[PDB]
Structures are given as C-alpha cells and as structure tokens.
DNA sequence: CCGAATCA
DNA sequence: AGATTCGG
C-alpha cells in the first residue's frame, strides 16, 4: 500500500555509509564534506535533500515528497542497528572542508573526509593558501612566540615543553598529564591562549576555576558536556592560594579529568559519559596549592613558567594592534602551520605527555621528601642492625624514626619554619603511633641506609 | 505520486535566500523588509504566502494549496542544511522597515535590507522624515541634555564619556567595559533611560539588581535570555552598599557580562549561548562597593556623573510635561540622531570603550595602591641593596615589608580610619606570612625604589 | 488538490478582520460584540462558524466541513503576518455587549465595538436602563459614600482624592502614583473595594503583601500576570511595621509596579511583558513604613484617610444587609455611573496622578528633611562666605556640616527620641567621613542659607 | 469532503443544552441525571454516545462511528463559545440521581435537575426512603447530637449556633463568618465532623493548620484547588498557643477566607480564581490567638464550645461501635434530613452568619 | 480505468 | 481539486 522503491532508495543511501548511528544513540550525517550531527533535530532528511541529486532520477523525483523522505528516513533509522563509534583517531584534525592530517601534513576533503568520522571540527573552511610557512604573518607570529618564550638555553627546556603542549593541544586522544602556564600578569599566557583559540576555533574552550575547586559529579553540570569531544580547554583566573578565601586544587579533580570518558550529567540529558581528548591548560599568577598530594598527582601535573613581561628573562613593549590582529584570525592559519610542524617534530609517531612537578613548592616539598623519605618495608628491615643506633626502632616488622627525631632532622633539608605548615600538613597527613607517643612515619632517610 | 513542480518552487524560494537556517537552528523569514522569526510557530509556511506573488502564475497557484505548501516547507527545511549564523555587524540598526546603517546614515530597505540578516529590530518603522537635525524636537532635546549633562569643562570629560557610552548604546557587539551612572534621585539617569528606550524600541532592556549580586549561571535565567541579542542594557535600584542588608557587586557577574557569548540557561529551552551585543549601563544612587576588586575589573568599570538636580554642578526645575512627550516619542527620532551624530563622532570606525574606575571610593583606593604598592619580582630583586635598610626583607627571592611597617606606611598615604575596613580587607586577601609573625605583602612602594 | 475557494473564503473573512493576531503572537476572534481570546485553544474555528452565516450560501456549506475549517483557519494564520497589538486607548470600558467610552458615556457594540480591540473585558452586560443617574439605587449609594467620605471642607481634599482614585479605576493606562487607603479596620475601605469589584467584574482583581515586600522578579509569578491587562489592584492585609516580624514595603516593587508594560515570568509560559494598566489601591489599617525612601518614591504615592467608623470624623452604624446587596450586584451600575461621572470631572480629557506622601510618618519626616535639608552644590558655595561661622565648613568643593552640628540641630525641628530611629537611618543612609570624624550630609539648612 | 448531516446532529445535541461550557474554559457533561466533567479527558464524545438514542434512528447510526462522534464533538466545541458560568444556587443540593432543594425539601431528577447547572455533587445516589424523620437512625443521632450538645437553656445559644453552622454547612455560598470548635479532646467535635463527611460525600474536604497559620498565596498550593466548589471545610489540629514554636493564627489568612473567589495557584494549571462556598469549620482544643486583633476579624469569628466529653457540661460515656455506624452511613441520610430540618429552621429564606467574638 | 469508499 | 483501496 506503499512505495516499495522507498526502501530500495534507503537501501542504497545506507550503502554510500552518509549516516551512521553513534555509541551514544545519535544520528550523524556527511553532508558538505563534514559530519554534521543535530540531536535536537534529525538531519537524516537533509542528509536526503543533499544526495537526492546522487541517485537515479527515478529516485530523486520520489524523494522530492516530504511524506515519502521521512519514509526513507525512517527506514534508514530501522535498518541502523550497530551504534558504530566515532571520534578513534587522535591524529586527524576536521575542518568545514574536511580532515587534514597530523602525520603528512595532507588534508582530505570530500570521499576521503568521509572515511574519518569526526563529529566536531576546527569551525571553518581550510585553506592551505594560508597554510604556509613561507609568509609575512608566519614570521610575525614566531617573532611574537619567541617574544613570549625566549629561544635561550636556560629557557629552552621550558620552550619545549611550551610547544610540546602547544602541539599537543591538537591531540584527539586523552591528556595523561595536565600542564601549568605559571607566570605573572600579561606574561603572554592570555596572547597564547587568543592565538589557539582563533587558530582551533569551534574546538577551543576555556573555563574558569569552577572545575578545579568543586566536585564536577554534582547533579548537572555544563562544564564536563562543554568540555566533550575538545581539543584544548583553558583553566583561568586562579586566586591568591596563599591567602584566606582561596580554595586549593583538588586533586581528585585533576585525576577526575585524566581520563578518555570523563564523567559527569549534562542539562536534561543523559550523556555522562563524556569523551575527554581536550588539552587541559591552567593559567595562573600564582603557584598552586592542592589539598592533596601524592606521586600520581605530580607525575599528571606539568608547569610551563612565562619569563618575559610585555609593558623575567626580558622585558618588552606592548603591542596594542596584535590583538585585534589576532581576532580577526590574521595568524590563525600561521599558529596552524606552526602546531602541525611542533606535533611532527614531538608527537610524531606517539604522543608524549611528560610531568614537571618541579616548579610549585609544595610540590618541591614533597619530590624532595619522596627522595628523602622513602618509605619502609620488610627489603628495609635488614637495615635495622645500622639504623638501631641511629634512632630507627623496628616497630611491627617497620623502620620507624621517632617523630621528635623526624621534626629535628627535617629543619636541616627543609626550613622549618618556611614548610611549618607543609611540614605539619605532611606530618598529619602521614604520621602514626606506635603506642600514644612515639609517633613515626613509615618513611627511611637515605642518608642513613 | 506527488508533484515534482513542489521541489522546483522549493528550489526558486531557497535561490532567493528569504529563509535562513539559524547557528541555533532556527528558521527565520524575509518578510515586510524584516527577518521575522519565530521558534514556536515556523512561519516557513507564511514567507510561502508572501513571496508566492513573485512567481510564476503556475507555481502561484500550486501555492494556493496548504499540504502543498507544507509539502514545500519541509522541501526547504531540508535544502537548508548549513546553520549559517547572522547578525555579525555592529553597525547596522534595524528597523521595521530595514536597515540604518550607522557609518553613512543612511536607511536600506527591501533587497537591500535584506542582505543584512538582523534577527531583532528597533520596533517600529523607520520615518526619515523625523529623522532630521532641524527640527524643533532636536533642539529641545539637546537642551534637555544639557542640563542633564552640563557643556562645561570641569564635566567636559564626563560628558563626552556620557556621550560615547549612548554611542555605544547602538553597538551591536560586545560591551568591552561597564559604564556606571552615578549620581543622586532624579538626575537625570531614570529621563536619559526612558529617552532611549523610546529611541531604541524592542532593542532596549532593563533589569534590576539580580544580575549584579546574585549568580547567573544556576539553572533557568530569565534575565539572560531576555539580554541576549540586545543594545543596550539598565541596571538600576540599587541598594545602599554602605550599610548592612546590601549585598556587594559580584566582579565575578561583571567579567561573565564580558563576552560574546554569555552562558545561561532560558525556560524550557536550549539556548545557554546567548549573544551579548548590548550597553549594559547602571543606575545608582550610591557609589558600589565590590566583593572582588582587582586590575581586570577595573578595566571593565567606567563610571559617568550625573551633576545637575532637577527640583551637583547645576539645579533646575522639574519639567512634569516632559515625561509624557518621552512616552509620546515626540524626542524619539532627534534622539536617534542625535546617537547617530555620536556614534559617528566617538565610534566610527572603531568601537571603543575605555575603564573610569576613579569615581569610586573602594576603586581609587585600589588604583591608588596599585599606583604606590608595585608586586615585588626577581626584577626588584636587585633593588635589596638599598631595600635592606628600609625594613624590606628578601624571601624566597621576594622583596618583602613587614606587616606592622605596612601598616604604619599606609596610614600616610591613607586615613587608617576611613580606609580601616579597605586596608583590612586587602591585606587580608593580599598578605602572606614568612613564618608565623613576619607577615608581608608581595608588593613595593615606589618612595623606596 | 483541494479546494481553491477555501482561500476565497478565509481572505473574505480577513478582509472583516474579526481575528487580529496580537503583539504577544496570539491570535483573538471578534464573537459576539467581543474580543475573545484564548492561546490554549485556538478560537479560529469558533469563529469561522460564527461567521459562516455573513457569507454567500456557497461559502457557507463549504465552511460546514470540519476539514475545509481547518484548512480555512490555517489560511487565516498564514495570512495573518503583522503582529498588531491591541488595548491602546485608555478611555474605553469593555463589556459582554460591547464598549461604553468614559469621555461622552457612550455605549458602542456590534461593528462599532469591532472598531476598538479590548482583549479583557467588565465581565458581564451592558444594561443602559440600569446605567442611569435618577435611581434609588444611586441615592443609596450615594449616601453610602457620604458615609465612607464626608463631604466636609476638612475631608474635601481626602474626599476628592479618594474620587479621583476611584475614576482612575477605569484608567486602561498606566498608574503613575501609587494610592495608600489608609485608615482603621472597617472603615469603608473594604465596602468599596467590594463595590468596586462588583462594579467592575472580571477586570478586578485583588492581592496581598506578597508583591508589596517581596521581589516579583524570582521564575514565575502568578501575580504578575493575573494583574497584567487589568484595570484596578487592591493590595489589602498589610502588617503592624512598627512591630517585629513584619516586613517594609520595597520601594524597588513600588517602582517596578509603575511601567506599562511590567516584567514577571508567568507559569509555564513566556509572557514576562506584562501590560500594566490597573489602577493598585493598597488597604492598610497602620501607616506604612518603607525600606527605601527618596524623592521619586514619595512622587509615586498618594494616601487617602478613611475618618469614619461604623459600629473618626463621625461614627455611625453598621448595616449589615448592605453587604448582601453588593454581593448582588444591585449598586453594580449605580456605582460605574458614578465612576463615570468622576472620570468626566477629573480624568478628562488627561489622566491625571498626583502624589500626597505628607500622610505618612517617615515620608513626613522624609519631606521636611527635604525642605530644610536642600542638598549641597557648587551653586551653594558662594554662601561659604557666610556659612563658614556656622559651622559649614567646605569639603571638596561642598558644604559640610558636622555631624555633631546636624543632629544637635535636627533635635530641634524633629523629635530625637521619636525619630531617633528615624534619624539614625536617614544619617547613615546619608553621611560622609571628611577624614574620620568630621563626618558629614552634603545638605543645608535654609535657615542659613 | 464531509457529511453535512454531522453539523444537523450537533445543532440538535446543542439544543438540548446537555453540553455547556464553563466560566472557566472547561465543558461540562449532562450523563446519567449529573453534570458530569473532566478536564483531562473531553466527556463530549461519551456524551454524544450516550444521548444518540435521543436521536432519529438517521442520527444514532452516524454517531456510532468515533470519527464522526469526534468531528460531531468538534461542531459543538465551535459552536459553544459563551463561557456561561454553573452553580450559581447556594439552595440546591447535587446528588448522583439529581439535586435535593433546601427550600422546600423536593428532589429533581432528571431534565429537572438538568436546569440546575453543579459541577460537583455529593458523590452518591440519593434515596428518599431513607430520607425520613420517622426512622429508628434520626431517634438514635438525634440523641447523640445532644449528648454532643445538650438542649438546656444555658447552652441553647451554644446548641443553636452549633446547628445554625451545621445547616450552613450545606450552604453553596460564601462564609461570612468562621466558625470555631472550642473545647478539648474528644468532646464531640470529631464525632460530628465524621457524621457531617458521612453525609455530604464528595462536598467534604478536611485540612489541617496549614491554611490557618501560613501563607496560602505562594506559588502552588494544591489545599486551595482541593477547597474550590466545597461545601464545607474542616480544620482541625491546632496546636497549643500558650506553648512556644505555635504560630499564631493568621488575620490576613481568616479575610482571604472570606470571599466568594478565593484566589490560589493549582499545580500546572489555571485555576487561580477558586470559587468558596465551603463552611469553614475550625477544630482545637485551645483558646484560639491571633496575630492581628481587630473588628472584622471580631465580625468573622463565631466560636462554638463543646461541654460534654466522652469518657464540660456533661460526662458520659463512650460509645465504641458508633464510629462503625458512622463509617457505614448507617446516619447519613437522618444527618442529611437533620441539615435540611436546620438550614429551614435558621437559613430559610436569608443565609445568617453572626459573629461571637465574646467567646 | 472510472467510481465510490475511505479520506491527511 | 488529500492519496490509496476497493469495487464496478
């Protein structure tokens, strides 16, 4: 009593693969060299509309009826049982014009686009007329880059890691390792976070210290459905730690946003499970201060330092005229160009995500205490026989030093008085009892192994 | 089994682009020289009616029939296909009859109007007949604004500040800068806000206090929707912040009413990015007091004085018949010029708006410790030699001034009584202890420098 | 496909225009001698059918067709395009039969009603023969109010404002100056809401203190838009201020409630432009104490004293039969001919408003202040000369008296112990710190002056 | 492309008046001798259903079909535009078999009770029979409603009152007056409150100290609908004023209580304007205290002290197996017939409300 | 293939 | 002069 080309038309609109059923239940269409995706509103019939022209004109006269279209477009959502995933490759960057690649260098467009599902993109059309090396705004932008990060040896670790991060703000894959802009006011943290922006587009974000000082997995939350399927996101505006009023970085927070699926309740929606595969940035003034501490949290933290100051390692001018320069997208396709050649010279072939902890003193503290204080076992009970005369007594099969003893030794590596509350925190944080008053901490100095 | 002709008429109404797919997804219309658009009701449907007289004879009539003409609406929900974003000008102001462009004066209407894509209008038709310079309405409203704002030069730099920001009122971008109305009851501020409103139509907004001292960002806001796509924006009502029962603008509200795009979420709707294109002004009696103050903010903040009572700079008697002539819209057209002279003085090319945080008490009080109280750095560092003997300590490579010298240097420069809660107040969010007692503030006077 | 002359018919019954589609984007029908309306559902097919029989016999059969209705009222909503809105004049009192104007007393209906778009209404018919002056039931009520207000030289100003409210109780316009029924209980305040309500029908409408000391604009509120659209608003039920546990009344509420088109988010709905053209009487027995006082607030509000009791200025006896006789609506037309003969005498040809405040302690307190506390300004600085030896001393360019001075001397024109609540308020709603001490009110007294 | 017979049927259904359309944009229903009405559901197809035997056979054979019912359903939603208002009569008594007058004592079934126009009724069938005086239930109530309150001289202004607020009760108009319940616990005041419910069915509604002592404008408040078109309300625990953390009874909430429309958001619906026909009644154990003191108030309070516990004016004893008759309307219709007796005693022609404030 | 029934 | 089915 219906038309039975109809399904013969889903049939072969199914076979060209133009619309695929996500994981999370959704409806995704290749329409204009882009895999454009509405949940609010099903594309399948513009995805119709759009390859009408594709198919036998018996076929795209009968695809002319909206009655007979939104047929097809329910057969085709019939016929999509498997909810295929998207978004694998994290070397693959889309654009409005299709999909250029980290590796080579080369962007696809059209069929070869189609073979790479992404389901965001940079939010405008490629050029790579613009992508060029060999320009004026190129060398404008590496003078102004080098202006931000010095080119010098004593800097050069710290440019690295920069244009590692920077290349790595790329990445479609999870961040193992969140990164630190530290510096002072207008170091050049806020010029690199705009250049980013108008080079990555759609696929920047940025966010405030809401993420780093409160539990995400709250009811609703629109930062984590914000934060899906990105590619950098910047977390600014970080207050005084040292002062009263200031919350401390939680580190259940950072381990939180360590991983591929990160979870967390959208607005009247059921899409907890958020992909994670944004770069994550901090900029700050000040060096941070975590109400926890430990060996994971300092090797998924790195701290990038801004040593030039723009009116530190130099002192410059400030250009007024670069940022409207930088809105109007100017080096957007230089910073582009520059992103691709950091990846291949570093995350080519593999993504590397290195931690520099060092750079935050309470994280000093605690590597200078991790390499001083390690902790007791039974490979350290033999050591017993040295360590008897030198205050250790073996407590329940464990090298413990009295904690009068511990206070006394810690003031000679670290000032007592300085680390007063690091060295109470730690203390609290780490102490035990062996009765009510020998109070020990199972850690050994190597000094006496 | 349906008719082909219904794609073709499709096709030509999509060539003429009288319908747009919206960034929210949205459908909007080019009817009456105005791009109507209505969420709840798709008035693809009525631009059919309209524009079926600018078609062939056969296709008109086809027209005629409504599940043909439903048929070709959803033809053309799905052609359209790309969600292209509109109203990007800042300097367009729309009308019920087209567009006012804002550098030349001069008004487009139909085709011509239509190239522009202006989701909100002013409210009204556009008469170029009242749009003129010499009339007797413009000359009693430049004498009603000056005795608002007197043409003196002790108020020269406050009125030409009033002047820019009314200019700005026009601006279809983004507020980069807070203007503040201050003064006493009846001013001036409530006649200038209810002149402007008639000027401006459905383009004018006003809201109280909420927004300043409560958070936006906790489920459904109202305010955020209605501010979203607007001109200008009135805070008004403001409480006495010197006394108790009042809360303290959020600078945190401030900087959120900074962007673009403000988040927030409206009723029972998907619209969190809301565009921010208006002049949010504020009306007070009193002078504000912040939660938070820092450089950021008052680069955000300007502050306008209104000198001249109506029975200050200046008092005059109370006009009572001048209301009604405002609700009238006698003054609405000299009004709208007189803003286009403005606009054309101040903002031509460029769009400019620049910070007066002097003109309040907590703000000049920051301005003025900022100007006498320089962050220490490593670049200060060399400055010890001559700092050692002033009481300033070096810790952690730091210059640091004890808290008791602080004190007792501040009280110089300023009232220790008037400033007692100020003074605490920042150090309390700017001090740092060395151990316990040395208690500094990571800042250097110049007087030592 | 369908039928051609369905839109013949549907442009036929647009050319009537008995359905207009309103500036909120509602559509209203013309049954009946009146303008029903309702958005739950759509009248349009009511009034195709009503209508029908104003049509040629080969239209009408057409219209008998449930579809062809349909078909008919969706032409009727394409076609209908320009959002025109409705209830402009103020002058104009809608019925069930039609529209009595207020300026000749003359009743219109039919096509002539057509001619005025009044989307509420009285509630009920129109009755001329009971819309007369030389009734029993005019003498009663007459007497009734005589006996509510004496006709007394003493209450002739109270009595005339008390009248003057009253026909601005059939104002459609906005209400430019809140009105205070003061008083003790049972003083005929009540009997006239109740007369006026019977009076009026639907278009009264009555609340609480709710608006009156809590903010309107939190999500929706109900009040707002019962309110919205209406003609007369009694706020009864006010608290002993003096007391503890009771709330003031927002100055903030009072302001928002003098727009004419007030905010306030409805339920599940968005019409947060709310019409405001009812009249708001507040029936108090205590007299009101506001949180916020200022020039403008005491502008917006006029008192009326009921002085007589009915078991003063004359005690009489309760009849306890008249309440029954309202509640039937047997003085309903006697009472609107009064109205009318009020609104002849004063509300023609203009509205008129003005404020009595000087019935209120603190606004008392608050006017005299602002009769010997003219505020101080640049024009007042010549008067230095002399005011230097009374203790004026000028300040940054403004005259300044010293605390001291000012409440030794505001002793002797208020009482310090009677308003020293209220002048500690005014003084810490008003004083300034010179340094620390020699704090000041940047107001004058004329007795120096 | 229809049947113009439709529009016919719905013309001739539309004669009969049996559809009607309220004040408040609803429909109503004449089914089974009751105004029946459901807002969730149009009852105008089950009507069209039900009155097609009404009909030529030529009418009833095109009604069976639900489509044609349906579009015959939509001619009559076209056709009904005056909002007409209903219930208008505080006199008349709705039943499930019709409407009892209070004035007279006649019953009306049928099209005599379709003139009368009530959205609620008393949610059962009336019966006559059972509506007698002669009857062993009215001798036996009769003499627990003077145990409740004695026939003696020092409480026959008491005992009048008490009755007078018993037969208003059954009043369709507004209370200009609230009523008390004084004394303490198990006086009787719950014995009546349960024969009064027993007798009126669906028209009782009962609440606590929520509407008394807070604010009843306030966004949502479902005790407000619940109390809209009631015949009386009852408003019991009240808690001890004299102790701390009590609330005081409310003046502002006592006037609001008092007007034939008593405003009130319903939950996500538009039924603020609830009509109050209701006899507030008021049930405590304490001496009631009031935030505010004034005349009206004085003028809208009538107390009502009940002198004989149950184990005071007299002490008897308690009957445990009443409470079974109660809950078995054994005395609902000898109740039905002792209001009928009152309301023709005291509000025949004129509805009275008196104040008594001495109390 | 035309008409009627069934009809968005 | 819904389309589509069923009947002629």
């Given at each position: 009593a219906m038309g039975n080309k109809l399904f013969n038309i889903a049939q072969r609109i199914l076979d060209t693969n133009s619309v695929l059923l996500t994981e999370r239940g959704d409806?995704?269409?290749?329409?204009?060299?882009?895999?454009?995706?509405?949940?609010?509103?099903?594309?399948?019939?513009?995805?119709?509309?759009?390859?009408?022209?594709?198919?036998?004109?018996?076929?795209?006269?009968?695809?002319?009826?909206?009655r007979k279209r939104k047929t097809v477009e329910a057969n085709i959502?019939?016929?999509?049982?498997?909810?295929?995933?998207?978004?694998?490759?994290?070397?693959?960057?889309?654009?409005?014009?299709?999909?250029?690649?980290?590796?080579?260098?080369?962007?696809?467009?059209?069929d070869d686009a189609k073979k790479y599902t992404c389901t965001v993109s940079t939010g405008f059309k490629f050029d790579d007329t613009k992508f060029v090396e060999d320009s004026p705004e190129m060398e404008?932008?590496?003078?102004?880059?080098?202006?931000?990060?010095?080119?010098?040896?004593?800097?050069?670790?710290?440019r690295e890691l920069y244009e590692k991060t920077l290349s790595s703000c790329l990445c479609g894959a999870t961040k193992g390792c969140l990164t630190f802009f530290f510096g002072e006011t207008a170091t050049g943290k806020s010029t690199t976070k705009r250049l980013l922006k108008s080079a990555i587009g759609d696929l920047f974000v940025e966010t405030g210290q809401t993420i780093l000082t409160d539990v995400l997995d709250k009811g609703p939350n629109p930062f984590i459905?914000?934060?899906?399927?990105?590619?950098?996101?910047?977390?600014?505006?970080?207050?005084?730690?040292?002062?009263?009023?200031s919350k401390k970085i939680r580190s259940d927070n950072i381990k939180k946003l360590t991983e591929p699926?990160?979870?967390?309740?959208?607005?009247?929606?059921?899409?907890?499970?958020?992909?994670?595969?944004?770069?994550?940035?901090?900029?700050?003034?000040?060096?941070?201060?975590?109400?926890?501490i430990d060996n994971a949290l300092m090797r998924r933290i790195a701290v990038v330092r801004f040593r030039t100051h723009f009116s530190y390692d130099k002192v410059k001018l400030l250009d007024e005229g670069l940022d409207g320069k930088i809105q109007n997208n100017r080096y957007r396709f230089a910073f582009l160009y520059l992103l691709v050649k950091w990846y291949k010279k570093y995350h080519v072939p593999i993504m590397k995500l290195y931690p520099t902890p060092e750079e935050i003193p309470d994280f000093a503290f605690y590597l200078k205490i991790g390499?001083?204080?390690?902790?007791?076992?039974?490979?350290?009970?033999?050591?017993?026989?040295?360590?008897?005369?030198?205050?250790?007594?073996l407590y329940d099969n464990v090298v413990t030093l009295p904690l009068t003893t511990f206070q006394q030794k810690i003031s000679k590596y670290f000032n007592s008085r300085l680390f007063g509350h690091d060295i109470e925190s730690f203390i609290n944080r780490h102490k035990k009892f062996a009765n009510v008053s020998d109070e020990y901490l199972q850690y050994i100095f190597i000094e006496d192994i």
């Open positions: 409806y995704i269409v290749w329409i204009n060299n882009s895999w454009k995706f509405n949940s609010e509103e099903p594309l399948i019939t513009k995805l119709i509309l759009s390859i009408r022209h594709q198919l036998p004109k018996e076929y795209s006269s009968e695809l002319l009826c909206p959502r019939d016929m999509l049982v498997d909810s295929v995933e998207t978004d694998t490759y994290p070397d693959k960057l889309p654009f409005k014009n299709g999909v250029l690649d980290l590796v080579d260098g080369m962007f696809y467009s059209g404008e932008l590496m003078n102004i880059i080098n202006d931000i990060q010095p080119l010098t040896d004593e800097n050069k670790k710290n459905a914000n934060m899906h399927l990105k590619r950098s996101v910047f977390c600014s505006e970080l207050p005084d730690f040292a002062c009263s009023g699926c990160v979870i967390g309740r959208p607005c009247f929606s059921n899409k907890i499970n958020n992909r994670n595969h944004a770069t994550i940035i901090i900029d700050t003034n000040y060096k941070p201060v975590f109400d926890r390499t001083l204080l390690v902790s007791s076992s039974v490979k350290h009970i033999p050591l017993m026989t040295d360590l008897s005369k030198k205050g250790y007594i």
